[PDB]
């Protein structure tokens, strides 16, 4: 057998799937600088914004006249929101409820209304229904979350709570995220109604049978939706994640306002204008960032790495190896039995472990890269 996680001679065997590795250079894998000293950065602003009063609000608006709000400049703790079982439905479609606690957005939208218990499934992406098509329409890319919970003891009256109304007939559909207030007559035939009375002319105001004796699947469930945006503004509505101190010119991992990435940060001679929030250069790779608090420009390159290659001259000839790291200045490597040793050499294509430069000149055989080549 062969261990494929031990010494580089054995790892060459594991890739070529043989016990007899011929002389030369093979590709083993890729290497990376693992990050340490994890850094996480948010803006200064740290007050809470009351989503709770919106969650725990006694009277909502209608299904076709849903109330819409924009929230900014807060931190919201989704952990106290996540574990709570007071909502009958808590489902997030475009996102996972457990991972909201890490990312920070801005311009969060919440629309609330009251609906029957069976229709709490209707508020979902790709769903058709009465209120899914005539009172509130949802896009196919509707990322976010929705919350419903029963309110039969409160939103149902013994005389019949008819205050929760909805439109029954309309000429056409409704666009997603629009509100109508015009309570107008419906033409159901060929006679133009002009809003008085009579057949093929119906009043869209019509009621529900809300009663406190009514059980599950028809109770008034208060439904609140949670909609988010992706990367239009400097993010203000953060999650329950704190901050730390930032370090430069060392391969770290960073959470800059919900933007997760890896690399070495250093001081940038570029010129951010004050309207700028962050940077990118080519094809959606964030090339420079100004931090959310000290408001100074850093630039990001993901920390230097490449492939690892093994120089072994054949398992019949010897057992000693050399290891190439592709394209790294061989100082930012943190194999600790080899890395500290007799000689470690640095190439224009990276660095060499277990090998010493000689002044010689040979008709070389095992290529390394950058014009240097290795041999036993």
């Amino acid at each position: 057998a062969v261990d494929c996680a031990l010494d580089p001679l054995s790892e060459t065997k594991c890739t070529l799937k043989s016990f007899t590795v011929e002389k030369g250079i093979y590709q083993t894998s890729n290497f990376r600088v693992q990050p340490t000293e994890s850094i996480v950065r948010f803006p200064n602003i740290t007050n809470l914004c009351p989503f709770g009063e919106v969650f725990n609000a006694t009277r909502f608006a209608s299904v076709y006249a849903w109330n819409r709000k924009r929230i900014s400049n807060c931190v919201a703790d989704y952990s106290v929101l996540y574990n709570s079982a007071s909502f009958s439905t808590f489902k997030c479609y475009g996102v996972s409820p457990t991972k909201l606690n890490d990312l920070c957005f801005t311009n969060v939208y919440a629309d609330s209304f009251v609906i029957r218990g069976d229709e709490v499934r209707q508020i979902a992406p790709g769903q058709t229904g009465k209120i899914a098509d005539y009172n509130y329409k949802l896009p196919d890319d509707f990322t976010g979350c929705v919350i419903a919970w029963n309110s039969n003891n409160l939103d149902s009256k013994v005389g019949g709570n008819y205050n929760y109304r909805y439109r029954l007939f309309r000429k056409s559909n409704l666009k997603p995220f629009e509100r109508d207030i015009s309570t107008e007559i419906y033409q159901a035939g060929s006679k133009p109604c002009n809003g008085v009375e009579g057949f093929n002319c119906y009043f869209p105001l019509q009621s529900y049978g809300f009663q406190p004796t009514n059980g599950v699947g028809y109770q008034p469930y208060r439904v609140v939706v949670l909609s988010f945006e992706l990367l239009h503004a400097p993010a203000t509505v953060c999650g329950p994640k704190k901050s730390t101190n930032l370090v430069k010119n060392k391969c770290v991992n960073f959470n800059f306002n919900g933007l997760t990435g890896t690399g070495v940060l250093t001081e940038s001679n570029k010129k951010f204008l004050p309207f700028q929030q962050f940077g990118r250069d080519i094809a959606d790779t964030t090339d420079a960032v100004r931090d959310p608090q000290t408001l100074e420009i850093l630039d990001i390159t993901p920390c230097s790495f490449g492939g690892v290659s093994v120089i072994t001259p054949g398992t019949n000839t010897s057992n000693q190896v050399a290891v190439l790291y592709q394209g790294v200045n061989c100082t930012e490597v943190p194999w600790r039995v080899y890395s500290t040793g007799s000689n470690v050499f640095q190439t224009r294509a990276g660095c060499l472990i277990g090998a010493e430069h000689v002044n010689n000149s040979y008709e070389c055989d095992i290529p390394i890269g950058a014009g240097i080549c290795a041999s036993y």
Partner: antibody
Amino acid sequence: QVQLQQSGPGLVKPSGTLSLTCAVSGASISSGDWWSWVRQSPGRGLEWIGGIFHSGTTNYSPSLKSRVTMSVDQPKNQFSLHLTSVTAADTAVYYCARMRGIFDYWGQGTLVTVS
Amino acid sequence: DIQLTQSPSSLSVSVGDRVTITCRASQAISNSLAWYQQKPGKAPKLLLYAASTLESGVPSRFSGSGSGTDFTLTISSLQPEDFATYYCQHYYSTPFFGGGTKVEI
């Protein structure tokens, strides 16, 4: 729900009369609801007869315009049907139902079986 | 007046497959049609209406399409207790319930 409860006796003799009633629970009559009735004859299926408005205006089908008159009781919260000269072709389950064009909520229906 | 010519009426198809109920009218009832479910010995129960808007409590396997003199009520998966008479009813004028398709086992 708009529950519509039908009440009274059901067995009748041939060439007799049916005086049927539909009590309304859960919907205001003072609204745009047309409080209507649907019978179920064999061969004809369900057939739209007509409905009433709470002010008294009415619209019927021409096959059952000549025999049906209906009235409204707003504080009693009901609506009725009157069939004059119930024939053997009226062997049908008569369903009171709330209408605004569509019939979103129904009564359960009484079959008229003359015996 | 606008009359309703049904198509499904009676049919004997097996479980879970597609059931068509075609209701054809004389004139344009493009937005004006309802679609009920009546078990024999029970009350009718409205499935769809008002240009494919579904009634609260009705599942989403039932879909509506069509406009004018071509309409449909579709059951994506038939059940044994789905033995019911499925009427079309327009409201472009004085209404009329269709013949009703008694979908049989």
